[PDB]
Amino acid sequence: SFSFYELKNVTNNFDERPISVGGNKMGEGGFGVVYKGYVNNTTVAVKKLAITTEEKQQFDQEIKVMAKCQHENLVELLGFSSDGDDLCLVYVYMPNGSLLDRLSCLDGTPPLSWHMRCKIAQGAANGINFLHENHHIHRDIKSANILLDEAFTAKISDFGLARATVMTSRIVGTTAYMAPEALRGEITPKSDIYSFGVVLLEIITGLPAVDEHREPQLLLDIKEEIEDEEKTIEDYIDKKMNDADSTSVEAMYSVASQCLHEKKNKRPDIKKVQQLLQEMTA
Ligand SMILES: CC(C)Oc1nc2nn([C@]34CO[C@](C)(C3)C4)cc2cc1C(=O)Nc1cccn([C@H]2C[C@H]2F)c1=O
Numbered sequence: 001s002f003s004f005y006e007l008k009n010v011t012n013n014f015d016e017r018p019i020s021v022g023g024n025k026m027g028e029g030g031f032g033v034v035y036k037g038y039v040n041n042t043t044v045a046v047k048k049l050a051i052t053t054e055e056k057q058q059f060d061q062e063i064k065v066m067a068k069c070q071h072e073n074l075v076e077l078l079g080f081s082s083d084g085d086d087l088c089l090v091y092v093y094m095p096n097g098s099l100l101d102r103l104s105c106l107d108g109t110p111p112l113s114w115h116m117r118c119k120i121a122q123g124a125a126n127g128i129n130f131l132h133e134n135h136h137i138h139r140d141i142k143s144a145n146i147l148l149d150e151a152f153t154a155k156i157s158d159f160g161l162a163r164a165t166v167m168t169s170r171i172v173g174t175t176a177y178m179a180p181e182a183l184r185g186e187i188t189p190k191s192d193i194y195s196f197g198v199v200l201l202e203i204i205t206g207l208p209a210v211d212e213h214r215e216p217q218l219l220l221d222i223k224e225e226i227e228d229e230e231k232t233i234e235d236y237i238d239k240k241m242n243d244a245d246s247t248s249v250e251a252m253y254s255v256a257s258q259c260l261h262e263k264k265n266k267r268p269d270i271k272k273v274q275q276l277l278q279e280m281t282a
Helices: 004-010 057-068 099-104 114-133 189-205 219-227 246-259 270-280
Strands: 025-028 032-039 042-049 077-081 088-092 146-148 154-156
Touching (some): 004 032, 004 042, 004 077, 004 088, 099 146, 114 146, 114 189, 114 246, 114 270, 189 219, 189 246, 219 246, 246 270
Antiparallel strands (some): 025 032, 032 042, 077 088, 146 154
16 A cells, blocks of 8 residues: 555656656556656556546456456556545556557667567467456457566556446447447457457557558458458568568468457457467467
8 A cells, every 4th residue: 555645756746747858657548647656666657547536436446356367467556545636556667668659669669579579469368368267358458558578578457447248338448449349338258359359450560559540540440451352461561570471470460350350259269369379379
């Protein structure tokens, strides 16, 4: 447990400037802003939450799922702070930031090699598999919620939407990653698989999941382009790599394609996805 005074103190008073300019801001999600902190001889990440105020519930839920789900491919939650002006979650610092940022080479980081893209996709599937085995649905699988430590091990983060077939009157998620049935209110782990297909296309292409100036705007729509023979896989392979063999890139694309089936019951389950990603680099 942490106090707002101490989290405030170790974040330079929640300095909103980017790290490069001298502040503490590392990024921001839909629901908060993430700051670097240095507390008790340890670098940490501190998310200050910031949707109706009752919609506090997320803070509450994030703590319960972290208690249950601990795994090599899941971010570790260090502590929290409910006292003070805002609420705050403290996590183990992830030295290579998010997969989203490393795919865009944000702040000058080197492009991820194909070999490391392959290991990261396997690691992220392992984290999803752990969640579904423990009867959890993440509901916000995306490359911004896959973080990378100093070994480039993938760790799933941001459990504020996770849940323990069923409809909800409160649809949540990130639209550019969301399966059709999840957009329409369904709660199923089959939807996490769909979102993971989009993440696999980010990893293949280096492109963001949505781009209003791009044709097509939604990355998941390049699957139909390739199927229609309007483009090839090769047209979309990230050029910022020189170790991407054709065979294994097409193999991961095929995985991404099966994940992106419109009909949830035609999608592979996470165990099949794990097996196929394993076979890719075997
Ligand atoms: C993605 C962004 C928000 O976080 C980070 N960006 C970073 N960039 N760099 C560098 C180093 O060299 C560079 C050139 C790349 C800058 C290091 C980073 C560490 C973090 C971090 O540890 N971030 C989280 C840890 C734990 C959890 N969560 C999420 C729940 C939310 F809080 C995190 O976000």
